[PDB]
JSON list of C-alpha atoms (C1' of nucleotides) and ligand atoms in Angstrom, two decimals:
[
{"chain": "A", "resi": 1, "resn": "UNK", "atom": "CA", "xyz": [-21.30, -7.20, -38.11]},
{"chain": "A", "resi": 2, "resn": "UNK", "atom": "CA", "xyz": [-24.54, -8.83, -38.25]},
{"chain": "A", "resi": 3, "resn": "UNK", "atom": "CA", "xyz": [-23.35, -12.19, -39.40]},
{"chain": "A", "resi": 4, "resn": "UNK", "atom": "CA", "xyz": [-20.42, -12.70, -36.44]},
{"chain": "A", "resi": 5, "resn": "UNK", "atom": "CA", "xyz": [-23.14, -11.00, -33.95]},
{"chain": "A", "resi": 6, "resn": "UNK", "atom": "CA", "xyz": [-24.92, -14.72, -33.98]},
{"chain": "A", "resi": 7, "resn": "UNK", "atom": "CA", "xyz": [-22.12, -16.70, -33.93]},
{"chain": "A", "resi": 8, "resn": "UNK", "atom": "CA", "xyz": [-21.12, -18.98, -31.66]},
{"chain": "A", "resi": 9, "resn": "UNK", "atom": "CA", "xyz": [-19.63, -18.34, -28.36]},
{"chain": "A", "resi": 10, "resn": "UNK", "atom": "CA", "xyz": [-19.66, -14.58, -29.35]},
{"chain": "A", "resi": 11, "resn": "UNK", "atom": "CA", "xyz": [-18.44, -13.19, -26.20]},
{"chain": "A", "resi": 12, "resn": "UNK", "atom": "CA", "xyz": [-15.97, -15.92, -25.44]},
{"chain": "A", "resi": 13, "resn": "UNK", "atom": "CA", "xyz": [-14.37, -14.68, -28.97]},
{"chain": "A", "resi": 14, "resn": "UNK", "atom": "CA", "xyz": [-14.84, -11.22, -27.96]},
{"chain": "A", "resi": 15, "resn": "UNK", "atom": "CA", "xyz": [-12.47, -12.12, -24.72]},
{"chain": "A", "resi": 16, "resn": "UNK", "atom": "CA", "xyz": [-10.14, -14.44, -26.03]},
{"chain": "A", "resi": 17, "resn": "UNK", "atom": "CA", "xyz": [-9.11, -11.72, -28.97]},
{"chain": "A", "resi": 18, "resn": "UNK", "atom": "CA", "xyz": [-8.46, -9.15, -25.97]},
{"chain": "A", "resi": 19, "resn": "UNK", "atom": "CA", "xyz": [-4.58, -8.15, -25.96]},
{"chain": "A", "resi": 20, "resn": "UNK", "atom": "CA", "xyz": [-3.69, -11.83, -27.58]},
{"chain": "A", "resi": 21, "resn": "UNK", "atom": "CA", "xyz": [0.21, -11.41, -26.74]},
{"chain": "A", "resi": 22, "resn": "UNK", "atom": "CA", "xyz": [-0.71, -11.34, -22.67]},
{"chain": "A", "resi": 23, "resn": "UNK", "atom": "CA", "xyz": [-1.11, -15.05, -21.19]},
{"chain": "A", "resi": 24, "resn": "UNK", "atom": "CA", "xyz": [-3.72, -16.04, -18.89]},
{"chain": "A", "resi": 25, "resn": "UNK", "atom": "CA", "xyz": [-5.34, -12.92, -16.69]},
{"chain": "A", "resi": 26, "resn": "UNK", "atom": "CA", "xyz": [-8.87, -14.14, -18.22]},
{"chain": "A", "resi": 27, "resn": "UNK", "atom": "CA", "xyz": [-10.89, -12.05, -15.27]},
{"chain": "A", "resi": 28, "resn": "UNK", "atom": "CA", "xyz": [-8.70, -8.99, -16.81]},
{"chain": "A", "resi": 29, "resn": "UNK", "atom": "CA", "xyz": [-9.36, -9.67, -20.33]},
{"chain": "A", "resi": 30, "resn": "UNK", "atom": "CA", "xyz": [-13.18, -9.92, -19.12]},
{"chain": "A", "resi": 31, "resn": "UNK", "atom": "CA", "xyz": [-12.78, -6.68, -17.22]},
{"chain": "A", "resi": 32, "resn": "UNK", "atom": "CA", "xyz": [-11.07, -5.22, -20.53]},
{"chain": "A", "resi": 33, "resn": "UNK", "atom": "CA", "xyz": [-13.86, -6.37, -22.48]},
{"chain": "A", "resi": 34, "resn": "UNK", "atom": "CA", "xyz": [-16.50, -5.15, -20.67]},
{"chain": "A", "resi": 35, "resn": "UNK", "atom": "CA", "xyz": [-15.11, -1.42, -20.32]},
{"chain": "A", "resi": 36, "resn": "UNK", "atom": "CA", "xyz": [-14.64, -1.20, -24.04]},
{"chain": "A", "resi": 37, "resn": "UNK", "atom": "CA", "xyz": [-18.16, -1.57, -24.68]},
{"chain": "A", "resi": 38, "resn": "UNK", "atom": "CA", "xyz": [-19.67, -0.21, -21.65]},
{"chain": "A", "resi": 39, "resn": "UNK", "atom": "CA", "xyz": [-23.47, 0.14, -20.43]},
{"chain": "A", "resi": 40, "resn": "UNK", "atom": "CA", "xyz": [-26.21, 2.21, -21.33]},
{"chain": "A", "resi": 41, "resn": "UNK", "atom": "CA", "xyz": [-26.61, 5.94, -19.53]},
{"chain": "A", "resi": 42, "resn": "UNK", "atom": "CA", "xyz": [-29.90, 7.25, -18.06]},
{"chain": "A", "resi": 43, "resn": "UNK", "atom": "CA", "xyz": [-31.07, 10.95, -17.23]},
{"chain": "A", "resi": 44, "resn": "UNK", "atom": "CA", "xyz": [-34.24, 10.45, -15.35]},
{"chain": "A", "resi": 45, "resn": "UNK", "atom": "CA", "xyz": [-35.88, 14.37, -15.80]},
{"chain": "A", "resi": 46, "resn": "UNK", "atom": "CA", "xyz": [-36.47, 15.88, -12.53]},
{"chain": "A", "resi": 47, "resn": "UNK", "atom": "CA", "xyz": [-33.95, 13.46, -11.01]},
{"chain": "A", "resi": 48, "resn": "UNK", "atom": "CA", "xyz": [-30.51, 12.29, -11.00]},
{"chain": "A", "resi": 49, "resn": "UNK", "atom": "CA", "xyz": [-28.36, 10.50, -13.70]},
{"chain": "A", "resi": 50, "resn": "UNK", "atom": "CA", "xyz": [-27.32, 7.30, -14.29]},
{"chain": "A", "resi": 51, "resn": "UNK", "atom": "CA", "xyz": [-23.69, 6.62, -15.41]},
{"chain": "A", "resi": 52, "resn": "UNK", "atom": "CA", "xyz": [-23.09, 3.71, -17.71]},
{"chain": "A", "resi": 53, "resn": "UNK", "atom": "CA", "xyz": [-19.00, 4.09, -18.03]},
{"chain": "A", "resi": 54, "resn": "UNK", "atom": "CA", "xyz": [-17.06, 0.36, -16.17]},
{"chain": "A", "resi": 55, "resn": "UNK", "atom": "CA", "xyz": [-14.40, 1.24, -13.70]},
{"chain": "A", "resi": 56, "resn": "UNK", "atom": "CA", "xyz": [-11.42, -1.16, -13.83]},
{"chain": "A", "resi": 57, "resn": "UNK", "atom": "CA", "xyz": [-9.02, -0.89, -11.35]},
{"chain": "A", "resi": 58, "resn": "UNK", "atom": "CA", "xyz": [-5.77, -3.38, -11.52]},
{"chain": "A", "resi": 59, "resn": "UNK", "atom": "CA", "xyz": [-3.51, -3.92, -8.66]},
{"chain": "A", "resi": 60, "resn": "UNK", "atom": "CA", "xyz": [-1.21, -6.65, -8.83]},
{"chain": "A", "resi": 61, "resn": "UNK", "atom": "CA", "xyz": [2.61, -7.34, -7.85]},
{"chain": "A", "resi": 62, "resn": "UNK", "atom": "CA", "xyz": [5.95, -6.15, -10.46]},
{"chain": "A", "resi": 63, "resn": "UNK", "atom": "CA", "xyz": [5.48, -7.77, -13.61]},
{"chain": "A", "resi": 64, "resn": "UNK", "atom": "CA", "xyz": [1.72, -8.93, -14.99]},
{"chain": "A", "resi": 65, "resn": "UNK", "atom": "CA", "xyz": [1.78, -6.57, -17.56]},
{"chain": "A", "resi": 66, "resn": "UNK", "atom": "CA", "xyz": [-0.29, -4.30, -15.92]},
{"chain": "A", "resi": 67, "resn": "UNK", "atom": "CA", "xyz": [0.86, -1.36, -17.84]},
{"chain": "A", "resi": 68, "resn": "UNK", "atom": "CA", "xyz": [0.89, -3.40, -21.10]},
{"chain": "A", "resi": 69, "resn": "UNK", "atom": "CA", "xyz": [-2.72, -3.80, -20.69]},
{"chain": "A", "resi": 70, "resn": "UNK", "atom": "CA", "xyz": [-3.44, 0.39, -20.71]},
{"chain": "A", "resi": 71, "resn": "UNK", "atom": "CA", "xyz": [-1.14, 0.05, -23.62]},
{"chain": "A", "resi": 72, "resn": "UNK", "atom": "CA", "xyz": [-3.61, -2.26, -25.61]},
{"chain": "A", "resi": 73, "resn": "UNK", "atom": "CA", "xyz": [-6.06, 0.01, -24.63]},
{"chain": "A", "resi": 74, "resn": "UNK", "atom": "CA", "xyz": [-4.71, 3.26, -25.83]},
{"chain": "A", "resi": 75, "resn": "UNK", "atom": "CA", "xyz": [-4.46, 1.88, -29.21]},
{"chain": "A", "resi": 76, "resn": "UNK", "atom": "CA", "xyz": [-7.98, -0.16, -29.47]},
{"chain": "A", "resi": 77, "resn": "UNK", "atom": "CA", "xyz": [-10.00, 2.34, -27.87]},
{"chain": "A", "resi": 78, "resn": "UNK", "atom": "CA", "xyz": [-11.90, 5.15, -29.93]},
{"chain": "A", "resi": 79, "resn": "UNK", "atom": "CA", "xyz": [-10.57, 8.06, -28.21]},
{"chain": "A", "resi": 80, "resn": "UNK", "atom": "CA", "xyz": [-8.18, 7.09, -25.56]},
{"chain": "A", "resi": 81, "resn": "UNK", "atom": "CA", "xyz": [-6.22, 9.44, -23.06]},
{"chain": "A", "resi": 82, "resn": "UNK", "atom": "CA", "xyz": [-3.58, 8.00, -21.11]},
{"chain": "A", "resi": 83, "resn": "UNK", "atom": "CA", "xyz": [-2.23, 9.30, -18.27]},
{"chain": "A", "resi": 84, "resn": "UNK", "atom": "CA", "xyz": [0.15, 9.01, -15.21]},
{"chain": "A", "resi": 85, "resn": "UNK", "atom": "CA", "xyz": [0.15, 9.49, -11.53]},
{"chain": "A", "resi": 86, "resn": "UNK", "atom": "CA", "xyz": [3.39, 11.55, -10.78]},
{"chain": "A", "resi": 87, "resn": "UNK", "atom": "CA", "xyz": [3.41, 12.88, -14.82]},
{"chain": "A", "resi": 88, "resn": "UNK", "atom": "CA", "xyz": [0.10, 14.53, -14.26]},
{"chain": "A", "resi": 89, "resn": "UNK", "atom": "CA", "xyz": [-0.83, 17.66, -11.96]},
{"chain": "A", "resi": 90, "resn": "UNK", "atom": "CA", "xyz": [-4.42, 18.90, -10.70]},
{"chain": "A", "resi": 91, "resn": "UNK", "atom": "CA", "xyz": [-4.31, 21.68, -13.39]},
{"chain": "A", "resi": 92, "resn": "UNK", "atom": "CA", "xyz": [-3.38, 19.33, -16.59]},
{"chain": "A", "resi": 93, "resn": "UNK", "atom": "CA", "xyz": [-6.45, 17.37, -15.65]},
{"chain": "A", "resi": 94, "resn": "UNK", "atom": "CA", "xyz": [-9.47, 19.67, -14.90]},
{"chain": "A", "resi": 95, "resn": "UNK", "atom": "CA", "xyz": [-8.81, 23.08, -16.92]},
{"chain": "A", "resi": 96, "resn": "UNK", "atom": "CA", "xyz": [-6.26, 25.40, -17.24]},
{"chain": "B", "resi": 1, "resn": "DC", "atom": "C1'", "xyz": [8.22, 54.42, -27.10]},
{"chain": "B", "resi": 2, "resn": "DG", "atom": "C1'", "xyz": [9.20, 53.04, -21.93]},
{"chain": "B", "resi": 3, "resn": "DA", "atom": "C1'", "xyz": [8.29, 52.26, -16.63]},
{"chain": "B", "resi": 4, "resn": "DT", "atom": "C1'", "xyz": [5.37, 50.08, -12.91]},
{"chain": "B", "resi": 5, "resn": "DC", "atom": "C1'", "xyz": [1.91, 46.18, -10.31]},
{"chain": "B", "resi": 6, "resn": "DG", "atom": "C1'", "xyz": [-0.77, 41.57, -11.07]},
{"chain": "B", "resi": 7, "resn": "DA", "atom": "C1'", "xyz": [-2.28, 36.98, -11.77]},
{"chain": "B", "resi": 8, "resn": "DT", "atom": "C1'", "xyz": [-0.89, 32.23, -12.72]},
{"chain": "B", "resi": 9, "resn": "DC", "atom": "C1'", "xyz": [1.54, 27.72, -12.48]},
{"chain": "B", "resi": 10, "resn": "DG", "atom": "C1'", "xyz": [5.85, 25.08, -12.42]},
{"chain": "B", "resi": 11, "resn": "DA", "atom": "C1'", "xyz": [10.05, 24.36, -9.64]},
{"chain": "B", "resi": 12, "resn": "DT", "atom": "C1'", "xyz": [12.84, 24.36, -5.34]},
{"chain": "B", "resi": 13, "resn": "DC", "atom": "C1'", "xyz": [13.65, 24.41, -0.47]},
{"chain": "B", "resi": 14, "resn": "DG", "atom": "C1'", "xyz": [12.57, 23.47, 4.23]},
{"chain": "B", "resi": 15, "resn": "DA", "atom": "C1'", "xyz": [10.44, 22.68, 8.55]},
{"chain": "B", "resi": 16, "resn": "DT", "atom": "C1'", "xyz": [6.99, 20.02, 11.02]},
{"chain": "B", "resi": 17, "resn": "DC", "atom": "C1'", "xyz": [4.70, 16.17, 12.13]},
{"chain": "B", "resi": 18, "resn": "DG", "atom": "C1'", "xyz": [5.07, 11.42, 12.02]},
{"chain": "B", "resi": 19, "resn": "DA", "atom": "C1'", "xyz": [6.85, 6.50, 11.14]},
{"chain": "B", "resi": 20, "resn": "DT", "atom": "C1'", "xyz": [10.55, 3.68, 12.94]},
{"chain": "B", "resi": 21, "resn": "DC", "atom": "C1'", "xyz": [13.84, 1.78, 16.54]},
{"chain": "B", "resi": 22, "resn": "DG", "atom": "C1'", "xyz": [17.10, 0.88, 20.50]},
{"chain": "B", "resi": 23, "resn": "DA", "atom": "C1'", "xyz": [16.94, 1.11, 25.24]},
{"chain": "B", "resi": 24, "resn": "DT", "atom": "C1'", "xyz": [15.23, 0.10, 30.39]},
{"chain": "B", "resi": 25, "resn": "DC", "atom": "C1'", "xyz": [11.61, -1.32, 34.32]},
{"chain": "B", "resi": 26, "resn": "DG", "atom": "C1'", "xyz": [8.61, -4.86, 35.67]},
{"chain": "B", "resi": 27, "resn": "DA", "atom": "C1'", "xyz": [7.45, -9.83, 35.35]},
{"chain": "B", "resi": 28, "resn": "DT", "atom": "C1'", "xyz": [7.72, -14.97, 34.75]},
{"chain": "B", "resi": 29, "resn": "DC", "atom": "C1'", "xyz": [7.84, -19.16, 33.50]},
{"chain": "B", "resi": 30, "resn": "DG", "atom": "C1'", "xyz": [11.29, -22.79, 31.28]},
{"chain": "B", "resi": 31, "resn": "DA", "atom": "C1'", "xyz": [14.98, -25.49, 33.03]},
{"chain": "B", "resi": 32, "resn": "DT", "atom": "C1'", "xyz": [17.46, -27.31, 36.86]},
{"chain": "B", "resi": 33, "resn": "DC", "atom": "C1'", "xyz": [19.28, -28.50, 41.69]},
{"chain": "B", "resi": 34, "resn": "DG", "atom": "C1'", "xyz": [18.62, -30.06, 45.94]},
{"chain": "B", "resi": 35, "resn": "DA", "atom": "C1'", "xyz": [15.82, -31.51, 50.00]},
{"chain": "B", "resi": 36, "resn": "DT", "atom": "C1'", "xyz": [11.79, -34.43, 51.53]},
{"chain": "B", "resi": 37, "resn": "DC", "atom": "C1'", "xyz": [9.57, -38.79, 51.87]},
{"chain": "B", "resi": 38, "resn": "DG", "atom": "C1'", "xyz": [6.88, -42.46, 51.00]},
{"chain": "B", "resi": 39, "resn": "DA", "atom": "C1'", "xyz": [7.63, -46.91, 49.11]},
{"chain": "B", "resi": 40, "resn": "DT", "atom": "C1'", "xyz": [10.30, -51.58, 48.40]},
{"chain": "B", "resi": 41, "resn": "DC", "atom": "C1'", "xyz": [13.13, -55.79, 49.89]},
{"chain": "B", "resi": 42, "resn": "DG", "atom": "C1'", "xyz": [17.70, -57.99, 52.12]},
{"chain": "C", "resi": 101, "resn": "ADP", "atom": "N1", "xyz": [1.03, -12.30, -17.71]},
{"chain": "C", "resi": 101, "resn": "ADP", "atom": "C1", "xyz": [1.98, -12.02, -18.65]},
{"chain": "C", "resi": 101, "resn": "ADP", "atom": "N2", "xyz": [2.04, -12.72, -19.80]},
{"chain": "C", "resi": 101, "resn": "ADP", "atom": "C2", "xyz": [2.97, -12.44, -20.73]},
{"chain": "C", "resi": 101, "resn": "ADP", "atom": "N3", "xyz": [3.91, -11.49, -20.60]},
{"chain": "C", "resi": 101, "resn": "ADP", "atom": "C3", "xyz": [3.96, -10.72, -19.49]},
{"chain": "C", "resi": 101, "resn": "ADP", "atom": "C4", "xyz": [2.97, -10.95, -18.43]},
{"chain": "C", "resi": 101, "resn": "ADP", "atom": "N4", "xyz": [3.24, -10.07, -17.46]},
{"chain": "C", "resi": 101, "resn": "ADP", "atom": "C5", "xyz": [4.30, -9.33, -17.85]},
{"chain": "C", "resi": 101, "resn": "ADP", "atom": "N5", "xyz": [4.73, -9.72, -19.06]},
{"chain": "C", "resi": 101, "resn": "ADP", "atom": "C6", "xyz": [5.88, -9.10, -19.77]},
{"chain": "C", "resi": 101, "resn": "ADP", "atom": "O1", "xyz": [6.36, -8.04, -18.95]},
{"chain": "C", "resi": 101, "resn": "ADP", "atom": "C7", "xyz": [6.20, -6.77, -19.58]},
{"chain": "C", "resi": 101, "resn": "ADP", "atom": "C8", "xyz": [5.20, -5.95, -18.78]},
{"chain": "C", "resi": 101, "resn": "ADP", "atom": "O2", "xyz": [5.83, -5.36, -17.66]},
{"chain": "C", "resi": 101, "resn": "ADP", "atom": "P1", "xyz": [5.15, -4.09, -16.93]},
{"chain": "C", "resi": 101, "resn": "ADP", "atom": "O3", "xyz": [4.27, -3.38, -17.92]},
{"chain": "C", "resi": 101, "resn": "ADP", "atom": "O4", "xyz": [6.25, -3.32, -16.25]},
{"chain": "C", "resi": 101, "resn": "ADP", "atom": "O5", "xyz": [4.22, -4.72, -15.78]},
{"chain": "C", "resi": 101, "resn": "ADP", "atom": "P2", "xyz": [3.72, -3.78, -14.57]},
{"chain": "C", "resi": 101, "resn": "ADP", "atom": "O6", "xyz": [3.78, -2.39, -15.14]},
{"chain": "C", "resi": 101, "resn": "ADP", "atom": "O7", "xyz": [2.31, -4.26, -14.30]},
{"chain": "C", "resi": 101, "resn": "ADP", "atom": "O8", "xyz": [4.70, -4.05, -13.46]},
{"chain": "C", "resi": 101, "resn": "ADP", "atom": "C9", "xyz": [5.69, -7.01, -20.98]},
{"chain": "C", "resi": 101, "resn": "ADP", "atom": "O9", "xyz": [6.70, -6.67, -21.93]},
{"chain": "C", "resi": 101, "resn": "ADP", "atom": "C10", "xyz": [5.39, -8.49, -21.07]},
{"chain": "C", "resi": 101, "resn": "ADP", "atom": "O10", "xyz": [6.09, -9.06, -22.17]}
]
DNA sequence: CGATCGATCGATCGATCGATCGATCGATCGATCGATCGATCG
């Protein structure tokens, strides 16, 4: 880990090896990127918290692979839960 | 060992408000037709 960490173009490698059967959509594969790893949370005492968790939000036209991309997701993400709008209801997301 | 209310959440229906659309009343300028007339030369 320590030895690709200093490599060359690090993050462009990081990028490039998101979902590598999907063409073009480099601001997604950014925006894929950057969730994965996400920020750094902060609990000032006394005071409110700070969440560190990236939002992604893709809207785009039949076709794109949209979906595909929550596909690549599910599977390279630690723990993963996929959902879907008309599958879910307000009880099978909060508690039951 | 059996009979009677209770709470929950999915599933279905339906009724109510709303999005969508064809129609008419009021208007008007684009296109045209004719009259007016000032200008030109035999
Ligand atoms: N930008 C793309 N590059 C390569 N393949 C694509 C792309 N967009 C869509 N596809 C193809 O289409 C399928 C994705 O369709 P889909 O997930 O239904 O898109 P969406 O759900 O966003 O409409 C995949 O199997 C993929 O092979």
């Amino acid at each position: 880990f320590r030895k690709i960490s200093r490599d060359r173009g690090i993050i462009d490698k990081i990028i490039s090896s998101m979902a590598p059967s999907i063409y073009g959509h480099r601001d997604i594969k950014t925006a894929v990127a950057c969730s994965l790893f996400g920020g750094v949370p902060k609990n000032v005492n006394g005071k409110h918290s700070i969440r560190g968790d990236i939002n992604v939000l893709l809207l785009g036209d039949p076709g794109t692979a949209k979906s595909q991309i929550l596909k690549y997701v599910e599977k390279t993400a630690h723990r993963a839960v996929f959902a879907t709008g008309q599958g879910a209801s307000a009880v099978g997301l909060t508690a039951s």
